[PDB]
């Protein structure tokens, strides 16, 4: 790797400058160099890495969207022939994305996931190891499709079933946890009842929970609660 | 449209 | 270039595609394949161009000045010794913004301008040169920093010179090069009271002529000429 | 800051 040589101090170091400079890509790079150091990370290292690629490919969906809504309106009826520039362009930026997530899941496999024993690391990078094939599915159409959506439901439920044996129902990774994974019920799996029972069910148990907790544990909790609030609000 | 996640 | 074997047509469909989809960087390297094809570009195509860059280098620019506030702040008194990696990487933004700079006038000297015998193309491309050369000077500390900050002036020179002989004074082209030349002077060249002399002038001659104009015309001088008046609202 | 060019 083009960071092999630089300290990872300094590459942490250099992670955090680049969020600063909003240059997400290059945090990206130096998150990547920083894992492939082999070390286990950190709670703030683990957030560096998730954030650098959440707004990487986030860059890379939003840019696939636009071009995918182009291309299905020039394929409609009474459309004047383009030639094969949209679907040639909206394919360059898709391959472009699936190279991201390969790159954000082989890191996790290669070797993450099977170092994280704690129920922070281990949830945190099987969601992420969800997200991303949840990502590789809204872009998927080929043979392995359903292959792929079930990577993104498997990850998902191992990191639920750890989080709900190892953690309360307000820490905030297992909140995360729940909120994507009902996105992935709703948007993925064609599964809307069980997206909106999951994000009822998660902030109702939290709600409960938030009693036990200091001023800035519940800020924390709170704010995770009102992303599904509003979540089911589109939903219901 | 982008429901939320984090 | 990796452009090379694309139609000159499709490089232009996606670079308005790439524009849609918030990718400058796409839009950038697909107008650079198109100038490279060695034909001149349209009215619309030097948009294409000078959009796509604009918004790089643009970004390059926020970097690096979040990125040198940091470094000089970390020289001050009192400031713990942080090891190379601000100035490290600085510098990597900065080499990344001087080789898009160099880039741009590269495709402005072989062979943009010297096949430019319009005014609007030649003013507009002369006023890109001096703009790529200001931003060098923006970063620029050797022995050639006279010598960058003197080719940014003498191509603005050049481009104003052709403006007041070739267009009228609410030519949009003409006061988007007097709006930037004035920041030149007051950011560049140290020289606030000749920029405040050209943007004042600049707008006085602009709102003579504008009984001229169509509605549509009058729009877009009024525009840049907001601009102008914001400038001077700043400086003085 | 940046004072407004185009
Ligand atoms: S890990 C990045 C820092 N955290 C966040 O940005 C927010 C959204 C505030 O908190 C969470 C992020 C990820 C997860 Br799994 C839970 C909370
Ligand atoms: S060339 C891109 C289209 N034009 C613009 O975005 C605005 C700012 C509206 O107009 C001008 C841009 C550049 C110049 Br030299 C003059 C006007
Ligand atoms: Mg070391
Ligand atoms: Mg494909
Ligand atoms: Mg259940
Ligand atoms: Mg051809
Ligand atoms: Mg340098
Ligand atoms: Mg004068």
Not at chain 1, 53 to 72: D, P, T
Not at chain 1, 145 to 164: C, G, H, L, T
Not at chain 1, 215 to 223: F, M, V
Request: aromatic fraction near 8%; charged fraction near 30%.
């Amino acid at each position: 790797g083009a960071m092999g040589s630089m300290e990872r101090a300094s590459l942490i170091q250099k992670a955090k400058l680049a969020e600063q400079a909003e240059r997400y890509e290059d945090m990206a790079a130096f998150m990547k160099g920083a894992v492939e150091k082999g070390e286990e990370l950190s709670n703030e290292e683990r957030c560096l890495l998730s954030v650098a690629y959440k707004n990487v490919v986030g860059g890379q969906r939003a840019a696939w969207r636009v071009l995918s809504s182009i291309e299905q309106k020039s394929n409609e009826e009474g459309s004047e022939e383009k030639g094969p520039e949209v679907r040639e362009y909206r394919e360059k930026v898709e391959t472009e994305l699936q190279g991201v997530c390969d790159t954000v899941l082989g890191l996790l496999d290669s070797h993450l996931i099977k170092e994280a024993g704690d129920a922070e690391s281990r949830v945190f990078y099987l969601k992420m190891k969800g997200d991303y094939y949840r990502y590789l599915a809204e872009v998927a159409t080929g043979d392995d499709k359903k292959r792929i959506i079930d990577s993104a439901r498997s990850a998902y439920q191992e990191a639920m079933d750890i989080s709900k044996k190892e953690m309360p129902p307000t820490n905030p990774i297992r909140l995360g946890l729940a909120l994507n994974f009902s996105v992935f019920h709703y948007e993925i799996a064609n599964s809307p009842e069980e997206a909106i029972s999951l994000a009822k069910t998660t902030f109702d148990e939290a709600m409960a929970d938030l009693h036990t907790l200091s001023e800035d544990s519940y800020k924390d909790s709170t704010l995770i609660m009102q992303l599904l609030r509003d979540n089911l609000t589109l939903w219901t | 449209g982008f429901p939320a996640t984090v």
